[PDB]
Amino acid sequence: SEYMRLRQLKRLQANMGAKALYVANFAKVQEKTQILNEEWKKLRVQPVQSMLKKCTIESIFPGFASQHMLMRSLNTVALVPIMYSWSPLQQNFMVEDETVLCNIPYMGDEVKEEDETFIEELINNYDGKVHGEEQCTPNIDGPNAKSVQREQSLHSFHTLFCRRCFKYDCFLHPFHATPNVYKRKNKEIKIEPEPCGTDCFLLLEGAKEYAMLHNVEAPSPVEWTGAEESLFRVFHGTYFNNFCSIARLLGTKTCKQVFQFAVKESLILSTQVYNYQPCDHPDRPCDSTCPCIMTQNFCEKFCQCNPDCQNRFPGCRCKTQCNTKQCPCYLAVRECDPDLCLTCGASEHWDCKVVSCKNCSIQRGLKKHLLLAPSDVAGWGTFIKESVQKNEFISEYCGELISQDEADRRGKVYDKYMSSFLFNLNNDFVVDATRKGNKIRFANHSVNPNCYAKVVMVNGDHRIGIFAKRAIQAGEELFFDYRYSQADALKYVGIER
Amino acid sequence: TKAARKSAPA
Amino acid sequence: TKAARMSAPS
Amino acid sequence: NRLYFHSDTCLPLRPQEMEVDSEDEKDPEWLREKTITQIEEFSDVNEGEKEVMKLWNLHVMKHGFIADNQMNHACMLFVENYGQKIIKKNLCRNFMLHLVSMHDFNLISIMSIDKAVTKLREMQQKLEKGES
Amino acid sequence: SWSHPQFEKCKYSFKCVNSLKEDHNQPLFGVQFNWHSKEGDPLVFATVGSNRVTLYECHSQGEIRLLQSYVDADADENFYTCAWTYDSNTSHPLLAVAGSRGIIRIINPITMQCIKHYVGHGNAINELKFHPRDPNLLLSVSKDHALRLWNIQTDTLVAIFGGVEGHRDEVLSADYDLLGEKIMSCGMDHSLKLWRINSKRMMNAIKESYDYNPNKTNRPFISQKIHFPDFSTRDIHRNYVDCVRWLGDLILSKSCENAIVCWKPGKMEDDIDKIKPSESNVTILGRFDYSQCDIWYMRFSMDFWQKMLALGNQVGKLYVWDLEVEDPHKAKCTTLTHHKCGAAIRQTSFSRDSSILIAVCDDASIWRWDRLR
Ligand SMILES: C[S@@+](CC[C@H](N)C(=O)[O-])C[C@H]1O[C@@H](n2cnc3c(N)ncnc32)[C@H](O)[C@@H]1O
Ligand SMILES: [Zn+2]
Ligand SMILES: [Zn+2]
Ligand SMILES: [Zn+2]
Ligand SMILES: [Zn+2]
Ligand SMILES: [Zn+2]
Ligand SMILES: [Zn+2]
Ligand SMILES: [Zn+2]
Ligand SMILES: [Zn+2]
């Protein structure tokens, strides 16, 4: 009940430490300022002396007469356009919706009721939330390693790895709440024909028979560390009864010792586009309930459906550059899959200068060298270093990947400040090059542009590509049609050269 | 609720 | 509510 | 015919600088620091798993692997480049777990695991020979 | 004005000896005493406001004499800040000025002409600061959400502080610590961020900026792009943080909430240099309560010895606190008022000897307060 004395006790403890700190710090302050003061006494800087349009400085205290001085003009300087800070990106960076508005955007000190209303409705989009408003498996390589199950030893890898990006905790895709992704489809089951083989398990009586039975004996005494045991369960799930190899991978155990441990363990226990998300309905096939069929997307190499699924896009058998409607991938508004398109050369040329399949540009990041300079139309513009021919890929429009709600929340202040970097990708996502992006973000709007945008399905991801509408000469500024409404085009991107 | 102003109103 | 966005011909 | 500017520092471009592109980079240094600090935030993941994941992520970022067919090469390329640091940082067991996980994900074969571990051991003996 | 009753008045006392008014009648946003003035030489200060930067000389019996007067050719220029420095080689004092356009200009008052100019900032410059030990290193905070560190000897951009973990909105102020090892920055995003410049990366970048010769190379000077601060907090103030200054190892910061807070990163015991960038704790040592300072862009200042702190409010009142106390909650205050001073005080400045305190207002007036012997 009388918690007051313990709360006041902690206030008292703090107040004493604070005065002790403040005093000790003030001593340091006086010590470092004496050092700076000493360095000052060494230098002899020249005193500033007295000195078109005049200036008059009037005093308010009687006894001081008004002063006049003829104003020295400061030379004209070259001004560069406005630009807020941004970070470079060559691939979209996924971003979670914000709960609390960082701060109220400053926009003047005038008495506008409509402006005060705007601030009220901005806060309401965050739901009144504005800042300031009213257990772990121990390391197997370490000394503290436990004897653990395969599923448990691999848990972090299985959980955090992105099958699509090939990276742990990727910045693009959300976590695959289905475990079939890390379930080996084609099992590698093998047993060595001849012994490895002085300490080979095949020399043990009735051992080869047991090995073929899973997919008696003899005792021969080994001390397994917890780490050795855990590594065994991991390798056993991938190698199976190929003890010749498991022993080789352990290194710290013989083929017979590994086999004897395996036996011991065996006696235990239509205009709109929709986002793509891989399907995983392990019993029912790809039907009206499958997310892929629902969202009008093809099943991909990442889908967990049966390989002989009709919904899966098959790639192409092209012997051309895949840059015409004659290529199925191109026709479907898709970049060639490096694991399906095996005839056109999309699966190779990783170190080559020329690529044989011209339907790879986005996934390979084969963008042209863009130059930044002040625009002839508005703000900063993007200029092409070298001449490009018609329909040649120029650059992907990269940026933060945000939700439609997050886009409207951000867009609210973007449109007030009269500048936006939002670009609709699909019904689920908006690419926002405001905070992170690349040089193609400075492309201005033109009702008669030299570039065009196209959202392409590139390896299970929608990506905005910017291509040449006609042949562009070197040094030209790039423009594309923003496709705003008739009204919005006049409101925000009105200037036409 | 209210946005901070850099200068006085009138 | 809907803020301006650049768009590509679908 | 006009004065160009650097996209990073808003500073201008001397004529002799137009041959290099500031954005000819798949893995910006902020992006690399971002993966390292995000992997470190995992409370539930141990020190060894964390360190391996960071190295692997920096490796795929540097090279920009996009196809499943590149994964056998990527694993060998990883032992060749980061292999010295794996032995040094005592991470061979966690690397083997990473390899097995790639196999479970249907990205690599048993030949890949065998090859990779053989190269790691071959270069372990090479380091050992030099530390004597 | 706080929870700890102070009955004794401040030991320092001041009297108003003069008030000037510039003809342009626009807010005077900045005032700096040239602390590099040689001992015995007269006290010289500069004021920025509108498109002008004029210099003044302090004399006995409250006389303020008009030394120099400059104007930008550009009518739409509005200067906000200034910083004094000296040319190491020639020993001429230089004055750096910046404002709305986002350009830094270095003025050589000895030669009466604008020598260097730096254009690069994406928007307005809210504060300019020189490194306390390297007079060529100039720090500029900006409305573009970034801080830039420039080497004025080689005209290079040493580093840009900002990006992935930088300020989300305008950077209003920043300050180097005593020996220029770190910077503490603040802004509209209600946050204070630490940036260490004694790190291997930064020390090497400064060394390199001096070695850079454009004549002897084809490539540009690679500037460091620092996206991650060494500490960040949002738990001190609940509004735009417009002023920050180091009190040795502690921080003094203010928002538009009528208090200057004395805080430190980490728990009470935690040392500044052992602070992990993940540090989620802050400690409040004290507060300096005052009234009517509800508008943002009002800067406090200290003397050379950091013995006293001065702040002006929106109604022309000036507060001076004696920082040489045992408890920061018991700092004595002397409040200076004048019947003709009622404009918002934008900034204050003490002379290096601390004998004169100047205060500039929104009505283009200057106020001279002389410390009583
Ligand atoms: C994607 S940004 C283009 C880069 C921008 N000009 C800059 O300097 O940061 C688009 C914004 O630039 C401006 N803008 C782009 N094209 C324009 C045009 N044709 N006329 C006027 N303003 C334009 C508008 O503020 C628009 O919302
Ligand atoms: Zn991914
Ligand atoms: Zn064997
Ligand atoms: Zn399906
Ligand atoms: Zn399917
Ligand atoms: Zn599917
Ligand atoms: Zn094809
Ligand atoms: Zn194809
Ligand atoms: Zn192809």
mmCIF file of N, CA, C and O in Angstrom, chain A residues 137-172:
data_model
loop_
_atom_site.group_PDB
_atom_site.id
_atom_site.type_symbol
_atom_site.label_atom_id
_atom_site.label_comp_id
_atom_site.label_asym_id
_atom_site.label_seq_id
_atom_site.Cartn_x
_atom_site.Cartn_y
_atom_site.Cartn_z
ATOM 1 N N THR A 137 19.037 -22.625 -29.694
ATOM 2 C CA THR A 137 19.854 -23.839 -29.602
ATOM 3 C C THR A 137 21.322 -23.391 -29.505
ATOM 4 O O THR A 137 21.743 -22.547 -30.289
ATOM 5 N N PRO A 138 22.103 -23.903 -28.542
ATOM 6 C CA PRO A 138 23.511 -23.475 -28.426
ATOM 7 C C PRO A 138 24.368 -23.843 -29.633
ATOM 8 O O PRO A 138 24.146 -24.885 -30.245
ATOM 9 N N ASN A 139 25.340 -22.992 -29.960
ATOM 10 C CA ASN A 139 26.253 -23.131 -31.091
ATOM 11 C C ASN A 139 27.000 -24.446 -31.096
ATOM 12 O O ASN A 139 27.751 -24.737 -30.164
ATOM 13 N N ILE A 140 26.820 -25.212 -32.206
ATOM 14 C CA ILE A 140 27.382 -26.531 -32.477
ATOM 15 C C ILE A 140 28.905 -26.505 -32.563
ATOM 16 O O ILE A 140 29.563 -27.472 -32.153
ATOM 17 N N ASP A 141 29.475 -25.391 -33.045
ATOM 18 C CA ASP A 141 30.921 -25.233 -33.092
ATOM 19 C C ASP A 141 31.538 -24.902 -31.730
ATOM 20 O O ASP A 141 32.743 -25.064 -31.543
ATOM 21 N N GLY A 142 30.724 -24.421 -30.800
ATOM 22 C CA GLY A 142 31.172 -24.028 -29.474
ATOM 23 C C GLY A 142 31.398 -25.179 -28.524
ATOM 24 O O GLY A 142 31.159 -26.357 -28.840
ATOM 25 N N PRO A 143 31.883 -24.834 -27.324
ATOM 26 C CA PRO A 143 32.133 -25.881 -26.319
ATOM 27 C C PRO A 143 30.858 -26.350 -25.609
ATOM 28 O O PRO A 143 30.854 -27.431 -25.030
ATOM 29 N N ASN A 144 29.784 -25.533 -25.667
ATOM 30 C CA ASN A 144 28.494 -25.747 -25.021
ATOM 31 C C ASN A 144 27.476 -26.462 -25.914
ATOM 32 O O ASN A 144 26.275 -26.329 -25.699
ATOM 33 N N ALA A 145 27.941 -27.220 -26.902
ATOM 34 C CA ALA A 145 27.058 -27.915 -27.832
ATOM 35 C C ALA A 145 26.320 -29.103 -27.209
ATOM 36 O O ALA A 145 26.945 -29.954 -26.557
ATOM 37 N N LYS A 146 24.980 -29.153 -27.429
ATOM 38 C CA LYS A 146 24.062 -30.206 -26.954
ATOM 39 C C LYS A 146 23.781 -31.285 -28.020
ATOM 40 O O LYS A 146 23.952 -31.049 -29.206
ATOM 41 N N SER A 147 23.301 -32.446 -27.591
ATOM 42 C CA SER A 147 22.860 -33.497 -28.501
ATOM 43 C C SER A 147 21.413 -33.148 -28.783
ATOM 44 O O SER A 147 20.567 -33.177 -27.890
ATOM 45 N N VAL A 148 21.135 -32.767 -30.014
ATOM 46 C CA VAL A 148 19.838 -32.258 -30.412
ATOM 47 C C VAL A 148 19.312 -32.946 -31.706
ATOM 48 O O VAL A 148 20.066 -33.628 -32.402
ATOM 49 N N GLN A 149 18.009 -32.826 -31.982
ATOM 50 C CA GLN A 149 17.405 -33.412 -33.177
ATOM 51 C C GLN A 149 17.763 -32.651 -34.441
ATOM 52 O O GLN A 149 18.036 -31.457 -34.380
ATOM 53 N N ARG A 150 17.695 -33.311 -35.608
ATOM 54 C CA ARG A 150 18.005 -32.668 -36.896
ATOM 55 C C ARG A 150 17.168 -31.414 -37.122
ATOM 56 O O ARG A 150 17.718 -30.363 -37.415
ATOM 57 N N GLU A 151 15.849 -31.539 -36.974
ATOM 58 C CA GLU A 151 14.814 -30.507 -37.120
ATOM 59 C C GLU A 151 15.134 -29.283 -36.280
ATOM 60 O O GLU A 151 14.979 -28.152 -36.742
ATOM 61 N N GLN A 152 15.650 -29.518 -35.070
ATOM 62 C CA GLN A 152 16.037 -28.506 -34.103
ATOM 63 C C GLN A 152 17.406 -27.885 -34.401
ATOM 64 O O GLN A 152 17.586 -26.700 -34.201
ATOM 65 N N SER A 153 18.366 -28.660 -34.887
ATOM 66 C CA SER A 153 19.698 -28.158 -35.249
ATOM 67 C C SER A 153 19.674 -27.264 -36.515
ATOM 68 O O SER A 153 20.489 -26.348 -36.666
ATOM 69 N N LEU A 154 18.748 -27.552 -37.421
ATOM 70 C CA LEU A 154 18.600 -26.820 -38.658
ATOM 71 C C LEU A 154 17.509 -25.741 -38.604
ATOM 72 O O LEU A 154 17.395 -24.971 -39.566
ATOM 73 N N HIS A 155 16.710 -25.676 -37.507
ATOM 74 C CA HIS A 155 15.597 -24.742 -37.355
ATOM 75 C C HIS A 155 15.872 -23.310 -37.808
ATOM 76 O O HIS A 155 15.035 -22.768 -38.518
ATOM 77 N N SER A 156 16.982 -22.682 -37.388
ATOM 78 C CA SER A 156 17.242 -21.292 -37.805
ATOM 79 C C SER A 156 17.437 -21.190 -39.295
ATOM 80 O O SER A 156 16.914 -20.277 -39.917
ATOM 81 N N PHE A 157 18.166 -22.151 -39.886
ATOM 82 C CA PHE A 157 18.438 -22.124 -41.314
ATOM 83 C C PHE A 157 17.166 -22.297 -42.087
ATOM 84 O O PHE A 157 16.852 -21.442 -42.903
ATOM 85 N N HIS A 158 16.380 -23.326 -41.750
ATOM 86 C CA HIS A 158 15.094 -23.587 -42.392
ATOM 87 C C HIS A 158 14.152 -22.377 -42.279
ATOM 88 O O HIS A 158 13.547 -21.974 -43.263
ATOM 89 N N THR A 159 14.063 -21.786 -41.094
ATOM 90 C CA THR A 159 13.172 -20.672 -40.821
ATOM 91 C C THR A 159 13.560 -19.382 -41.529
ATOM 92 O O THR A 159 12.718 -18.773 -42.191
ATOM 93 N N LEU A 160 14.819 -18.967 -41.392
ATOM 94 C CA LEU A 160 15.278 -17.698 -41.891
ATOM 95 C C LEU A 160 15.691 -17.670 -43.344
ATOM 96 O O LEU A 160 15.812 -16.572 -43.879
ATOM 97 N N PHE A 161 15.956 -18.822 -43.992
ATOM 98 C CA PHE A 161 16.432 -18.800 -45.383
ATOM 99 C C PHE A 161 15.367 -18.499 -46.395
ATOM 100 O O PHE A 161 14.304 -19.114 -46.328
ATOM 101 N N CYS A 162 15.655 -17.600 -47.377
ATOM 102 C CA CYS A 162 14.700 -17.372 -48.455
ATOM 103 C C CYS A 162 15.054 -18.185 -49.661
ATOM 104 O O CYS A 162 16.069 -17.896 -50.314
ATOM 105 N N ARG A 163 14.193 -19.190 -49.982
ATOM 106 C CA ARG A 163 14.373 -20.061 -51.135
ATOM 107 C C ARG A 163 14.480 -19.235 -52.444
ATOM 108 O O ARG A 163 15.229 -19.601 -53.343
ATOM 109 N N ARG A 164 13.751 -18.120 -52.534
ATOM 110 C CA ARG A 164 13.740 -17.283 -53.718
ATOM 111 C C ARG A 164 15.008 -16.459 -53.905
ATOM 112 O O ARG A 164 15.614 -16.554 -54.967
ATOM 113 N N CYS A 165 15.406 -15.646 -52.896
ATOM 114 C CA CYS A 165 16.590 -14.755 -52.935
ATOM 115 C C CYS A 165 17.887 -15.451 -52.746
ATOM 116 O O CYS A 165 18.902 -14.852 -53.085
ATOM 117 N N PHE A 166 17.880 -16.616 -52.072
ATOM 118 C CA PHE A 166 19.059 -17.354 -51.652
ATOM 119 C C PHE A 166 19.783 -16.637 -50.507
ATOM 120 O O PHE A 166 21.005 -16.745 -50.400
ATOM 121 N N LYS A 167 19.049 -15.906 -49.659
ATOM 122 C CA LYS A 167 19.639 -15.195 -48.525
ATOM 123 C C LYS A 167 18.775 -15.321 -47.276
ATOM 124 O O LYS A 167 17.548 -15.422 -47.365
ATOM 125 N N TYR A 168 19.431 -15.304 -46.104
ATOM 126 C CA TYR A 168 18.795 -15.412 -44.795
ATOM 127 C C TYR A 168 18.248 -14.068 -44.410
ATOM 128 O O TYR A 168 18.968 -13.080 -44.479
ATOM 129 N N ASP A 169 16.964 -14.029 -44.021
ATOM 130 C CA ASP A 169 16.254 -12.821 -43.634
ATOM 131 C C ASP A 169 16.309 -11.797 -44.767
ATOM 132 O O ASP A 169 16.941 -10.741 -44.629
ATOM 133 N N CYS A 170 15.746 -12.171 -45.930
ATOM 134 C CA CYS A 170 15.812 -11.299 -47.097
ATOM 135 C C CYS A 170 14.973 -10.075 -46.894
ATOM 136 O O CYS A 170 14.058 -10.069 -46.057
ATOM 137 N N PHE A 171 15.312 -9.017 -47.633
ATOM 138 C CA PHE A 171 14.577 -7.768 -47.553
ATOM 139 C C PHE A 171 13.402 -7.696 -48.486
ATOM 140 O O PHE A 171 12.833 -6.624 -48.618
ATOM 141 N N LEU A 172 13.052 -8.786 -49.160
ATOM 142 C CA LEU A 172 12.002 -8.753 -50.134
ATOM 143 C C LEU A 172 10.827 -9.606 -49.794
ATOM 144 O O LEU A 172 9.702 -9.162 -49.991
#
